[PDB]
Amino acid sequence: PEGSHQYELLKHAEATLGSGNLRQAVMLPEGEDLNEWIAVNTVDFFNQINMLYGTITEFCTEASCPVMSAYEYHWADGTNIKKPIKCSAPKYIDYLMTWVQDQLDDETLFPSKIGVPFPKNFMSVAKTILKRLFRVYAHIYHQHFDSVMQLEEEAHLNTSFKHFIFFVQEFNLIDRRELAPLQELIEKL
C-alpha cells in the first residue's frame, strides 16, 4: 500500500468493517481487481497477525513450545529448506513471518508500480500465504488462549480472525483440510 490507491482499498476494507456484516464487507467492491483486493487484505492480515502474536511472544518461548502444534507443523518453505524439519513455534513463526514478508517484498508477486499485472501464478502464492498465517492463528487459539484473555488483547484476535475466515471463505483461499483445527470455531461464527 504505497499510500496510493491500494491505501484506499485498505481503508476500504478497514472502514467497511464497522457494518458488522463481515460476509459482505469482504467481497470485491464493484469494478475492482480480484488480485489487487486479495493482495491488500493479505497484507493487512499479515500485519494484524504479526502484531497480535507480538503481544504473546513472552508466553510463546522455546520452552513453552517445543514444537509448532495444537496437528504438527514443520518448516519446509520451499527453495531454502526442501525437507520439512521440526522446530520451536517461536522459531517457526519467525521463519514463516520473514517468508511472508519476502513474498510481500518481491515485485514479481506484489508490485508497487501500478499497471503491472500480478503474476499468472499469483493466488497460488496468496493462498499459500494465508494458510501459513492461519497456522499462527491456530497456535494462538490452542495453547495461549488464556494468555490473551488475561492480557488486554482478546476481542481483537476474535474480530481479526472472524474477518480472516470470512474473507478466505468468500474467495476459497484456504482448504477445509487446513481449517481442521478451529473447525469448531469456523462453525460458531
Distances (CA, A) of 76 to 132, 142, 149: 11, 22, 32
| Residue 148 binds Zn ion, judged by CB under 5 A | no
Q: Is 87 one of the annotated binding-site residues?
A: no
Determine contact, residues 184/75, Cβ cutoff 8 Å.
no
DSSP letter at 17? G
DSSP letter at 142? H
Question: How many Cα atoms within 13 Å fall on the side-chain side of residue 157?
Answer: 26
Q: Is 60 one of the annotated binding-site residues?
A: yes
- At its nearest, how many Å lie between Zn ion and the CB of residue 35? 34
Determine contact, residues 36/118, Cβ cutoff 8 Å.
yes
| Residue 186 binds Zn ion, judged by CB under 5 A | no
Which residue is associated with the grid cell 514443520?
74
Q: Which of 9, 65, 136, 174 binds Zn ion (CB under 5 A)?
A: 65
What is d(CA 67, CA 53) in angstroms, rounded to the nearest whole number? Answer: 16
What is d(CA 179, CA 141) in angstroms, rounded to the nearest whole number? Answer: 13
Closest to Zn ion by CB, 23 vs 142, is 142
What is d(CA 73, CA 178) in angstroms, rounded to the nearest whole number? Answer: 11
Label residue 139 left, alpha or beta by phi (over 0 means left) and psi (-120 to 50 means alpha): alpha
- At its nearest, how many Å lie between Zn ion and the CB of residue 88? 9
Closest to Zn ion by CB, 10 vs 70, is 70
Q: Which of 25, 40, 52, 60 binds Zn ion (CB under 5 A)?
A: 60
| Residue 13 binds Zn ion, judged by CB under 5 A | no
Closest to Zn ion by CB, 89 vs 168, is 89
| Residue 140 binds Zn ion, judged by CB under 5 A | no
- At its nearest, how many Å lie between Zn ion and the CB of residue 65? 4
Closest to Zn ion by CB, 16 vs 69, is 69
Residue nearest to Zn ion (CB): 60
- In the region spanning residues 82 to 121, those forming contacts with Zn ion, defined by CB under 5 A, are 89
Interacting residue ranges for Zn ion, rule: CB under 5 A: 60, 65, 89, 143
Binding residues for Zn(2+): 60, 65, 139, 144
Binding residues: 60, 65, 139, 144
